Amino acid sequence: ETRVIVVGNEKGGAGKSTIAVHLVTALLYGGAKVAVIDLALRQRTSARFFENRRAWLDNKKIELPEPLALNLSDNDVALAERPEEEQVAGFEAAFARAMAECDFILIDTPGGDSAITRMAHGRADLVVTPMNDSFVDFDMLGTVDPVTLELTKPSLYSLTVWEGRKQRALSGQAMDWVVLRNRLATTEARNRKRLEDRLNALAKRVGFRIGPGLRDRVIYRELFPFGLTIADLSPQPVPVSLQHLAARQELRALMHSLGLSAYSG
Amino acid sequence: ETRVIVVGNEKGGAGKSTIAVHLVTALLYGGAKVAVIDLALRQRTSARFFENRRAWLDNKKIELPEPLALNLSDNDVALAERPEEEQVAGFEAAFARAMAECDFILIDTPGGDSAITRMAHGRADLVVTPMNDSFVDFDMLGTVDPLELTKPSLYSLTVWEGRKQRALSGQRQAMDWVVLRNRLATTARNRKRLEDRLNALAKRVGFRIGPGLRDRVIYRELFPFGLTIADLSPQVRPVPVSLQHLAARQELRALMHSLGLSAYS
Ligand SMILES: Nc1ncnc2c1ncn2[C@@H]1O[C@H](COP(=O)(O)OP(=O)(O)OP(O)(O)=S)[C@@H](O)[C@H]1O
Ligand SMILES: Nc1ncnc2c1ncn2[C@@H]1O[C@H](COP(=O)(O)OP(=O)(O)OP(O)(O)=S)[C@@H](O)[C@H]1O
Ligand SMILES: [Mg+2]
Ligand SMILES: [Mg+2]
């Protein structure tokens, strides 16, 4: 069937590239055959991750699953400068070509608005939208009243997904949308509550369902230079910590909630 | 003579808007007369902050310092769609008009690339560049080998060119560039590996490292009201006090000094 996952949030630093790289890496290890498309043309975090994996595995001469990384150009930083049309054309090539060869297409998007970004939301089966536990992030999903503090209306990014559905209702056939809270820390109780309320109210208005959070964790960020993740450090030498264990736990919970239980452990 | 501060990092979620809103608020309370310009045309986090302050102070009928918030349009979300030229024209109007009426101009920038963004880097006296303690963020400053540092990177160049553009108007008073680490958490190994590259890069690219902020609810918790710690006297209290407050106003102060604004703490 070939399912397409779009990781999205207009907000910067929501954790989009981090959830995408760990999604890919988990799927790979569930036998699946993944394609990774990175639409952050300049930053190219997912793309950079896997260039580092490539270069690393190579040097150490060990072997591990690699996705099928796909660029729009021979130089995307450069392509970022050409007009929308050329970017879209590039996307075209990369998407079409991945439809062929892969079971999942993982698309990581950038933290603003663009043609290719909008195009990706319209061709997606699942939209995973990680966010920070914070009203600053929440403001791209829904507008809250300063005095009352009631939610008040959907907001910029909500609309972006709402239109990526109307664009899937020309080719007729239901889009899962999951918002999960990422980089969770210790206390934050009062704020985590006020936020959790609006989060729910908004779900009813806009049609997403909340997934399980990840917590702030060095291991989610520490291995980027090598292009590795926790899913690569398994005992299957191997030093396992309580933290590593909590982490692969959360990832697993996450995987299930996205209905990818078929590919965990 | 009317100094201009540009908060910058191409990386999303580096903390730009959070450092800018607290800079403005600290300056205000040091007697200064600030202008706030937000070039994140869609998100408009700093602009949203102060619309909430406006609406909140109004409702509670209390009085507190407000900056001079400046829009490029009557609708910037809309302006985000017009061509570069029109955006730049809008900037023009807003910058020029703030040169007149203010001692500091605080410009918050978005987490990608744009004309107005590049224009702001060329007219800046100080560039405050907050980043996450993370190699993912670091990759927009400098490229590291999968054993170590090889070259400057996308955003380093953006500032390096905003200097060459200040070297037409020959400002003997060069541009100060400060990179500080933001959202610091508890536990060491990653914070060290990073701190090394951070220094090496400084020598190559010409910035100096400033004191970090730590991950703290209070830095994020008051956004809906458009308030900050600097507002939390006995009269203003929408939120119960924590021991955290003192450590917070501490870091802010340390920060302020390091940017040579000791005059306003
Ligand atoms: N659960 C987590 N635990 C620890 N670190 C995290 C976690 N999630 C994200 N990070 C780090 O947080 C920062 C933001 O994460 P990214 O995934 O890079 O965000 P993003 O949404 O891709 O941002 P852009 O720049 O808008 S794409 C990075 O420095 C990551 O290293
Ligand atoms: N020191 C801090 N403590 C706690 N939360 C923080 C801190 N710094 C930033 N945040 C939160 O981190 C997220 C990113 O910070 P922002 O200031 O929004 O980043 P940004 O650089 O404006 O990213 P763009 O503009 O969206 S790219 C927001 O949810 C803030 O509420
Ligand atoms: Mg990214
Ligand atoms: Mg912002």
Numbering used by the authors:
A (entry chain B): 3 to 175, 178 to 240, 243 to 271
B (entry chain A): 3 to 148, 151 to 191, 193 to 270
Relevant lines from the article:
Protein gradients play a central role in the spatial organization of cells, but the mechanisms of their formation are incompletely understood. This study analyzes the determinants responsible for establishing bipolar gradients of the ATPase MipZ, a key regulator of division site placement in Caulobacter crescentus. MipZ dynamically interacts with the polar ParB-parS complexes, forming a subcellular gradient with concentration maxima at the tips of the cell and a minimum at the cell center. It inhibits polymerization of the tubulin homolog FtsZ into the so-called Z ring, a structure that forms the basis of the bacterial divison apparatus (Erickson et al., 2010). MipZ belongs to the Mrp/MinD family of P loop ATPases, a heterogeneous group of proteins that act as nucleotide-dependent molecular switches (Leipe et al., 2002).
Similar to other Mrp/MinD-type ATPases (Leonard et al., 2005; Schindelin et al., 1997; Wu et al., 2011), MipZ forms a nucleotide “sandwich,” with the ATP-binding sites constituting the core of the dimer interface. In addition, several residues from one subunit form key hydrogen bonds with the nucleotide associated with the other subunit, suggesting that ATP(γS) binding is critical for dimer formation. Consistent with a direct, adaptor-like role of the nucleotide in dimerization, MipZ undergoes only minor conformational changes upon transition from the apo to the ATP-bound state (rmsd of 0.76 Ǻ). Most structural alterations occur in protein regions that contribute to the dimer interface, especially the P loop, the segment ranging from β sheet 5 to helix 6, and the first residues of helix 8, thereby repositioning the side chains critical for intrasubunit interaction. The MipZ dimer displays a central cleft that extends along the subunit interface down to the nucleotide-binding sites, with its bottom being lined by the phosphates of the two nucleotide moieties. The mouth of this cleft is highly negatively charged (bottom, central right). The remaining surface areas of the MipZ dimer, in particular the side across the opening of the cleft (bottom, right), display a high density of positive charges, thus potentially constituting a DNA-binding surface. The first exchange (K13A) targeted Lys13, which contacts the α- and γ-phosphates of the nucleotide bound to the adjacent subunit and might play a key role in both ATP hydrolysis and ATP-dependent dimerization. An additional substitution (G14V) replaced the highly conserved Gly14 in the P loop with a bulky valine residue, causing a steric clash with the γ-phosphate and the Val14 residue of the adjacent subunit that probably also interferes with dimer formation. The third mutation (K18Q) exchanged Lys18, which constitutes an integral part of the nucleotide-binding site, interacting with the β- and γ-phosphates of the nucleotide associated with the cis subunit.
